[PDB]
């Protein structure tokens, strides 16, 4: 059985999503101390990121652009900052060099869209990147959205430090600025990240796409909290840890979601199937068919 | 058994194919509203094309580079235009959105050579033109290199249209031009499609 329609939901509470911070280009700044807004309880317009697939670099992770119209998410954050082109590519599994891996980094395990465009204007005190400083290596497992003040030497070279003082025998400290276009690989870009957050609890951000709310008990394609799949939607038939409400099977598929309208957990059961075994006589006669 | 030679062809008339206007770097404009000359019954000039050993894109399908001298054509069209860096990037198939498909795409099924290089002659009329319009949707599924003027709207919605309107409620009438160095990736480049 093939899906009959896809189900796209609206949340319990439907207000306006205040994406303006980044779509009106209010401010870009401060990569680890963002100017951002939280998007929750609302119908999102992804108009910018639905009707344009051009820009400068447009790479979504987890999703591709013009898909945001089908997916619902738990929260969405509208984030902004400015980095250089050699640094933009480092959000993706990018290149080595002193351009560094850590200047935000967004692996597909975490859903988000990162859009580079250049209309740099109105961003004050972003030239020099100061008020924060962070390390390239540390003892407490460097991750983005981290700030460090160095007092100790990182000594981790392939040939030991305190003697030859090679590689990883220095004090990394980082805080990246940008300067205007002059040539190739000298060009800044403003970066908008929409972080699409997929967590336990009901989805609160959905698109303006058609209301198919509470349509159940037939084979459909569902778009429930940024997770998709095919099946027949019915009420959950199993117990849960409240922190774990959105499924991952052996196949990394989702069987379970928390419903965006109700407080219930919705389980998706696979579509009807059976083998067809065709029995036919020969052509000595007419071809009669009985089908198991 | 290996070959020792190829079969060699020559047209029935000695006239050089009038590749003139495109060569002298003129009338490069729009991206649909092309300067198109039909080339037929003439001697090709593609020996020197493959031997120029140049171009940012030299993307051929169905015809054979460095073997184009024996390769006869029934109709050759030379279409000359200016598009921006970012559009040149997107010429190959499998782009983002169904809105890329009608921006400009030259499929891998499409027979021809994409000649693109870093020349920046001619800047105006890449959207200024009035013969430069295209469709996104059509109820008869318009395919690329096609333009029309319609009274009738393909209206379906991702949310049913009228009262409430989603996406694909548009009157699907487009044209995009560009203004370079007002952003990045809007630099013009000349492209010729054979």
């Amino acid at each position: 059985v093939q899906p009959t329609e896809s189900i796209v939901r609206f949340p319990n509470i439907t207000n306006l999503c205040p994406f303006g911070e980044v779509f009106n280009a209010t401010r870009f700044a401060s990569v680890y101390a963002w100017n951002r807004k939280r998007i929750s309880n609302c119908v999102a317009d992804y108009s910018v990121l639905y009707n344009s697939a051009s820009f400068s670099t447009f790479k979504c992770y987890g999703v591709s652009p013009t898909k945001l119209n089908d997916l619902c998410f738990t929260n969405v954050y509208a984030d902004s900052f400015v980095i250089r082109g050699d640094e933009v590519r480092q959000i993706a599994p990018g290149q080595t060099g002193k351009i560094a891996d850590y200047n935000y980094k967004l692996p597909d395990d975490f859903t988000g869209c990162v859009i580079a465009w250049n209309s740099n204007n109105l961003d004050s005190k972003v030239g020099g990147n100061y008020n924060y400083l962070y390390r390239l290596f540390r003892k407490s497992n460097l991750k983005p959205f981290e700030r460090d003040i160095s007092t100790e030497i990182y000594q981790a070279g392939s040939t030991p430090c305190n003697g030859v003082e090679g590689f990883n025998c220095y004090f990394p400290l980082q805080s990246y600025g940008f300067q205007p276009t002059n040539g190739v690989g000298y060009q800044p870009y403003r970066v908008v990240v929409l972080s699409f957050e997929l967590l336990h609890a009901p989805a609160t951000v959905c698109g303006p796409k058609k209301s198919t709310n509470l349509v159940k008990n037939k084979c459909v394609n569902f778009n429930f909290n940024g997770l998709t799949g095919t099946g027949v939607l019915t009420e959950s038939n199993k117990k849960f840890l409240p922190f774990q409400q959105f499924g991952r099977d052996i196949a990394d598929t989702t069987d379970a979601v928390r419903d965006p309208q109700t407080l219930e957990i919705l389980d998706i059961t696979p579509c009807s199937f059976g083998g067809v075994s065709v029995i036919t006589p020969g052509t000595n006669t007419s071809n009669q068919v009985a089908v198991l | 058994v290996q070959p020792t030679e190829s079969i060699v062809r020559f047209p029935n008339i000695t006239n050089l194919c009038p590749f003139g206007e495109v060569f002298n770097a003129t009338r490069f404009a729009s991206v649909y509203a092309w300067n198109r000359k039909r080339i037929s019954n003439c001697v090709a000039d593609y020996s020197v094309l493959y031997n120029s050993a140049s171009f940012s894109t030299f993307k051929c399908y169905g015809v054979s580079p460095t073997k184009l001298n024996d390769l006869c054509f029934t109709n050759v069209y030379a279409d000359s235009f200016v598009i921006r860096g970012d559009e040149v990037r997107q010429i190959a198939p499998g782009q983002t959105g169904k809105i890329a498909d009608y921006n400009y795409k030259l499929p891998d099924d499409f027979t021809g050579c994409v000649i693109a290089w870093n020349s920046n002659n001619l800047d105006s009329k890449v959207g200024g033109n009035y013969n430069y319009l295209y469709r996104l949707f059509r109820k008869s599924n318009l395919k690329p290199f096609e333009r029309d003027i319609s009274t009738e709207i393909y209206q379906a919605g991702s949310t049913p249209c009228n009262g409430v309107e989603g996406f694909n409620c548009y009157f699907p009438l487009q044209s995009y031009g560009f203004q370079p160095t007002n952003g990045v990736g809007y630099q013009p480049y000349r492209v010729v499609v054979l």
Partner: nanobody
Framework: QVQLVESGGGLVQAGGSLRLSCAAS????????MGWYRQAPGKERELVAG????????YYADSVKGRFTISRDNAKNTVYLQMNSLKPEDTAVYYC????????????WGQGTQVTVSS
């Protein structure tokens, strides 16, 4: 796409008519349609109106309650954009455009111009 120069707009009462001024970009100038876009800092860019070239055939969306009119000159090309029968609900930031377009602050059309109806 990048650069469009907008002016015109202003404060009117519901009803009447209102015109915008624009040094119309090839982005929109050369299209079969050049009508309106509108937005509000509460809601993202929406289609307003477009037109079929030659003839009296215009279309407008329910994004507005107006009955806006588009006319074109098909020789020495210029576009006449005039709003008609504005209702309070039509208050918005306007841009010139067809129904489809690729707006973004990275594909800025400047600031546009503000139209307020019975504010």
């Amino acid at each position: 796409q990048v650069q469009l120069v907008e002016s015109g707009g202003g404060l009117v009462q519901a009803g009447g008519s209102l015109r915008l001024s624009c040094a119309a970009s090839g982005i929109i100038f050369g299209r079969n349609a050049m009508g309106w876009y509108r937005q509000a800092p509460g809601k993202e860019r929406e289609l307003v109106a477009g037109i079929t070239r030659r003839g009296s055939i215009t279309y407008y969306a329910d994004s507005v309650k107006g009955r806006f009119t588009i006319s074109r000159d098909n020789a020495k090309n210029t576009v006449y954009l005039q709003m008609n029968s504005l209702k309070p609900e039509d208050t918005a930031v306007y841009y010139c455009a067809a129904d489809p377009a690729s707006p973004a602050p990275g594909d800025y059309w400047g600031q546009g111009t503000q139209v307020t109806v019975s504010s």
